[PDB]
Symmetry: D2
Subunit: 509 residues, 4 copies
Amino acid sequence: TLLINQPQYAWLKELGLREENEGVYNGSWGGRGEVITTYCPANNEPIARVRQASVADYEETVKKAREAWKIWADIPAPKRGEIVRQIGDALREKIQVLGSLVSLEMGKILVEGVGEVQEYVDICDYAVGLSRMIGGPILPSERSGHALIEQWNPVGLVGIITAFNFPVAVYGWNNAIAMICGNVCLWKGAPTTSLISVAVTKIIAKVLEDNKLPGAICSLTCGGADIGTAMAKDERVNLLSFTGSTQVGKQVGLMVQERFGRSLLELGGNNAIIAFEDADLSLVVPSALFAAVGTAGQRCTTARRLFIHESIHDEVVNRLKKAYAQIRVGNPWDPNVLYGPLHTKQAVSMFLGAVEEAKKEGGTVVYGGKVMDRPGNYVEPTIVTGLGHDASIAHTETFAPILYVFKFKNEEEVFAWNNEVKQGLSSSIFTKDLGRIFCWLGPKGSDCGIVNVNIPTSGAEIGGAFGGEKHTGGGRESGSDAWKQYMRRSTCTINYSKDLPLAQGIKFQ
Amino acid sequence: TLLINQPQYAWLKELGLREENEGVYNGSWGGRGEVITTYCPANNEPIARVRQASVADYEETVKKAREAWKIWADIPAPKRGEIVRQIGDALREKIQVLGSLVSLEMGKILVEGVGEVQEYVDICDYAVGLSRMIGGPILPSERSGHALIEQWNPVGLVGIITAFNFPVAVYGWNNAIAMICGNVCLWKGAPTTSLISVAVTKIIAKVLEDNKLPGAICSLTCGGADIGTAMAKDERVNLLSFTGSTQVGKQVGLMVQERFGRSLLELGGNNAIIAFEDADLSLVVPSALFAAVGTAGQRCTTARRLFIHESIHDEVVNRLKKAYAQIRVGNPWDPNVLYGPLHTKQAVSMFLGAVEEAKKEGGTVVYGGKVMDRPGNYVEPTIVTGLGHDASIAHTETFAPILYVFKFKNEEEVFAWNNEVKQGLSSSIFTKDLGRIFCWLGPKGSDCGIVNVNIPTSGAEIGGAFGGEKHTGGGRESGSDAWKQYMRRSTCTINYSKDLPLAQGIKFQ
Amino acid sequence: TLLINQPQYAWLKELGLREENEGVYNGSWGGRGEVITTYCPANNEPIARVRQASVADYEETVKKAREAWKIWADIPAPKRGEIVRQIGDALREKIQVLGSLVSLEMGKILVEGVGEVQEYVDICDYAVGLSRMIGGPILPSERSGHALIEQWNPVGLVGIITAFNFPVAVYGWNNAIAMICGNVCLWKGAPTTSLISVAVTKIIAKVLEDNKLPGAICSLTCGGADIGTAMAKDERVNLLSFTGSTQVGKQVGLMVQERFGRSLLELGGNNAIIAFEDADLSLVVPSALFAAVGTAGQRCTTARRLFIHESIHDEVVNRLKKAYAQIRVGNPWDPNVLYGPLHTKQAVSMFLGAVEEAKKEGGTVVYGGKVMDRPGNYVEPTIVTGLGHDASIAHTETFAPILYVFKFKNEEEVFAWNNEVKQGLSSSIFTKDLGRIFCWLGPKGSDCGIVNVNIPTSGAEIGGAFGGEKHTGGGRESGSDAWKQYMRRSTCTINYSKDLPLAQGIKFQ
Amino acid sequence: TLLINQPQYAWLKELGLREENEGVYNGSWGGRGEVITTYCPANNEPIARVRQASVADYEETVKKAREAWKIWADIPAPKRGEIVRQIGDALREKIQVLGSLVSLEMGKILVEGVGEVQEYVDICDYAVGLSRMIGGPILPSERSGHALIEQWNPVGLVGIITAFNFPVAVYGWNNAIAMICGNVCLWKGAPTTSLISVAVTKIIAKVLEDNKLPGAICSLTCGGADIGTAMAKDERVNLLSFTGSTQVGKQVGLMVQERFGRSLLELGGNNAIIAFEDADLSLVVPSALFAAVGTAGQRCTTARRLFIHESIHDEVVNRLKKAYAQIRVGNPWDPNVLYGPLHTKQAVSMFLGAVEEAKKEGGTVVYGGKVMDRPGNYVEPTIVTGLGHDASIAHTETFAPILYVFKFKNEEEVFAWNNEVKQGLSSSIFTKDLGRIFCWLGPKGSDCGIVNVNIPTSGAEIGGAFGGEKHTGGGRESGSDAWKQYMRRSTCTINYSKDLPLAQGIKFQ
């Protein structure tokens, strides 16, 4: 029987969720595609069902979204910001129940589910101010009697494909920014977090309807690769923001490139922490532990490589092991719990595949490496030593809590090992050395999109642009001038003079 | 006999050119690939020869450039700016002969040959100032005792593939900007302007050598599709700036996307001028004439579609006819000449094919449409009326002076008509109406990268970013924050505090 | 008897006002100075009393504010934004009653009273986003091994002196921006809007105290010329933002300059509307009326000079007269009322003095010019023709609804007449001419801080910096980078290298 | 006999200098005021004469400058940059002889005179790029059918009063920036560097005349306090940039404030170097020596206070003593000299008063403190220990090479001691501590406009804005957005719509 029909989970009804939910919204709710059941990874119990989008559902939604864009693009940006402010408020009112659904359906611990909604709330309030700021410079033209202005305008329909592991915030970052930039949005979330997508869409849809705006401004078409592939090939999707694996993201980038679309890619990570000999080990150990095992190691910014200077390597590994053993495991909604399950059974199989591969490639499991004998998709957070920094399994992103630990001696080689992988998302050094810090930040430092000092690989806030380089895709979200990806630039020269161009010897009238 | 061996053209030697020239420069000059002879399009006479790059040359040059980047990225940006200033001055010293070579080898008139070099001089001087400005904001972190900074660092090796029609300036825009941004450059020019590429490279090579810097910072590998494709597939080329046809540019963009490189695409145009009923006809006629037939219609920003309100359509056509007849044809280096030959004979075949196609699709040739009976690749500048705006040949970019004239009645439909094509480079309206002007600049206006008012489609200066949308590729060059395409952004969080992370109940030491 | 003691006005109690109110807040409420009773200008009845600050109150408050700054400056800018966001919400909950108090005590109509509070709400929401954005660039140092960063830090204590006519918004702009910029504030409002200052401070005080923050971050010392002068002479007031008359503002500016403090001066206006022969008269006539008679002509941005091209002068005046006769007068809190009373009985006398002066200088009163025979400080909105543009009374700011009308012929002279006065606040032309518009916006155009086109002199929103030039004082508030006046810039060079400076022949160790 | 009349000084003629030089330039050369003779401070020999400005000279020049502004304000900013580029080139051609004039007439060593001219050349090249960038944002209006633009226009006439100690660079910074910003300039240099002012003006005047531009764009009126005071009282001088003593600068600021002009104040410094126990002493000692005795201690950024941690105080003082003993004294034009004379005999007298006062206030002269018994104005570079950090003489700026040395123990008090003085120009700490460095850069760190780390107080480059806080005046020169002080901002709202304002119940026609 479904969890939503059990009294313990009656709070789901506060999100407007029922036994079977419509997975398409374009101003009206529907869903004529395949019905999907999503499961709680903490006990493998079914929660509720979502009717996904058919092709006809998708077609109607895209058409309705583009119609609504005619209205929405004419609303002054500060007024679009007001809507996004109200979206932030509607999220605040539901932050507890929504964060509980993230914990239930995705499986991260409750504070992180609530934290994910706080991120959406925060980006909305940031985007309110940005909505009075976006634009380009008025530049001095070299031409007398001419103006030169750089204009920014919405691209139109922004498709937003998101991953299971941040089922609210990632969409939130794209939605708040794309909306103030005058775009309509079409959301296709990960199938295994369909309820989260539906619940978020209901909160947003109420704000739009209360403001007598066409609901298709924030359209939703739940679906899998079928719908995702349509969006990547669809010329009507002016910007396709894809957050997901590098493997899938590469094909989406090619499909969008084929049709001269815009893509914003947020792909895989293989993030390293480097602890130098002068590092505060009382900061290194907890920073590494929490960055490696947080979210059961299923963050794009999870620390998956730990380089320790040889002088302190054994002590850090030993202190890390003694700390890992104190990780409190339980239901991700239960208090004091720090560690929940992997998102799917398949991830557990991939976890076990990686551990064996690390063993064959010469690595030693000094902690973990096994499934936990309990309901749900629980695996032990795992520490592997002795692999070469160039081991193939170390260069792969295994979206599971496995930390590969390496020795190093000198600064130049270990920056190179950080940069040698194909991923380019997050990175961190722990050190007190002022010259080393700025070398790390400089042209011979880390090649990642996020380059941190004395804070782990998940250190990131709304203020800055978030994203990676190389196989991480190159897109940026949230802060700085990331909004420019959601708009088109035009360089506009206006002749307001009476001057006529030189006749150049031709006799005009 | 080669033009370089005739006393009449001995000025070529002031650029360091000889009978047979090395087309590979990486600090040394060489070239083991095919020897190409380029011809003067004004008389189809051979000028001189250039030995192109073989694969071994390309491999050697990329290795040397990437080594030199280690040196060049360590040079403080303002000092790189000093280098670019010296390059600008070196171009000043050769501006006359180099413009003559552009006129001789490419075929544009001398004033534009000189003007193209001046643009490079100008963009150098701009980059001198920019070299003290590039960077990102210090942002106020939400975390006490942390700094949040946005860093920009060079991408590394910037490959630069350029087209025949602006064989100095396009490279120049990419070189000056990529260089102050700390990148090394690898140039593959159009095969038919191989002498221009060698001449420019020699000018830069002396400046680098005088500053005791590795010449491979501005490397040259002359070649055709073979070398161009290698750059598009080469993981060592961090950014590939490609200027050329949409057809070729699309394949470059896919190859770069396939390997998760960066591309900067500057592809084709199909640029429209719209003359409204209130336009100043004394501005419309010369603006349209010079924009349509300039550079024999071989600018990416050439006016290829002219929309005129019905009330003034016949008068504007008649005045354009009276003006076209006065276009002075001759050798592009001859004094007072306004119109030279097409770049190749193949271009003439495309011209005649387009004219014949337009007549077959119902258009009327009211001026031109014929070859000129003289040496070189000379065709008559051509005006075509009576085609429907949706005619297939009107929607294709034929790189020749063919101006298709259409009637319109209303603002909305003609804005739709500007936007209905696949190209998205330049656009112009001519009008006095204030509200129309701002609609053109707004979200329901022109969808192009250059959006002009009372100035034709070639109105652009270095102060602003230059580039197009849709099938024009989305890249930007020169002004505004175009320099960011030449760098990688990192969002850097620095914990300078002694604060430790929350223990969350785990007992650390 | 006091209005607050009559049941008709018991809503005053919803703002926490009582018969006698404390006019000092520094974390504690007090007031040992003079007790002032403020009056409703619509009926000359007393409203309630306020105990103003003694010298000892001011001394104690400044000390408490600077101690509070030590805590407040340590709060990360985004979290200060969160406090400001909450101030915005608290103002929302009180917007109706607070605007009603503005109408009651100051005398502007209700929609402008609520609009003034909405302005404070809007700038707060803006300041939330800005709080993640304020800062400077990281610049590329010319020195190898050096970083060059521009830092921004709070100035410390921002004193805020405000005028009667915007008793909420002006303070709001300064408070929201100063607060996220890490400053503490000291407010001295106009004595005749003391209840408004008390009421606003109570709303702010609750948010600060609810967040366990020292109340002195938003300190209040109600008082007149005494307290303002002390603030202007007090070295502990790092920035004094003064809004008021040019006469007082000039003395405030000199006192602050004497002590090498910072001032932000928002002084008097003498704002002109220019209607050209091509202007849309159906837009001009209402624009002038609402800008001239709005707030009974007591906005700093009120239209006080109307230049009409001679061809349309008689018609525009005739149409204005026909419209003026329909202006509805009444209690400013009554919904049909468009026109309320002048702020004081003295202001009424000044109205009469100016009118008599206009007649003495040769002007003709073609509409209005008299007090209205009703209770309160009601005067007829007045139109004066025939004065020379250089007439002494026309160059004076009379804070009353008197519109001086002038003929003009040429564009250059009427721009000159816009600029010939000492005030430099706001300016408007109404025209369709593209060249004239950009000339107006250009260096030979309007010399004012607000330069409007086809919208009157009160056209302004928070997105932009608000303020004037010349005797208007030069300060700026609200939008763009106006925040920089509330912070101090430092240009910071960090040598992180191991490099030692040249010995220059000296033997070091 | 005049130095210029001796063959040994025939090089002065390369600057166009003669026996008696006209000290007024406004397109014509003149000078009816008093004839001043300037002397070489190394030997008190007269160099040549300058005819200073009478009042009538000044009056005619301001009028000619403002007339020239009408032409200059119409020239596109990029083209004004081209003028400044050419100024940069003309300075390049004369850098050696001009630098020799700086050493001869002002008295700093040859490398610094030449370096001073290089600084002017550099800011020109920078301003060339800036001239295509200056301007404001296009903002998203909250009003449908409205544009919101921030425009910047020249202020008009920029008066520039400069000090003796940087008689070329300071003017150059203001001139390069003021000119690209569309202002004309009126220069009054220090009387005792009049020949330098004329030599510079001659170089600029040639560039203007070769470009057929009115010479009054860069006017020169040589004179003393009288001409200086007239500029500060003159309503026609829209911005007065003043570089000089705090004493004089305070009166300049008050006079400018009195007439609601703009002032840009660059006043005195009392700059501290702080050495923490973890400092690289091999970096500290030379840094301290060169920053304290450079330019005979007559830089505004000269290190005048040295704070050393008690653990290392005696060692740093001893090592500094041993380094002072090796400072090479001689004629500033001798290439082996490091230390030349003070600028005037009065400076020597002030030096002696300071040394005596330091003794009277309890300090011990551990090195120097005496006049040198030799021709010219030579004093010994001086180190004073034992004074309390609050001794009055240490809080005074004595423009002489006197270094006051103090002990400190903790970080909080030494930051307070850096900040306790009235001056706020430059500041430096030497340390490796990451947290201490960012505290220094933060809100509880240095209160100065220049805040340096492991580089002395004279560390600044044109890329950043240069200037101080508190009694240093608050102005900024050169980099960042310093250009904005030379222009006026306008916030411009343009209604381009057909929309009419709500009638609010009035029946219009």
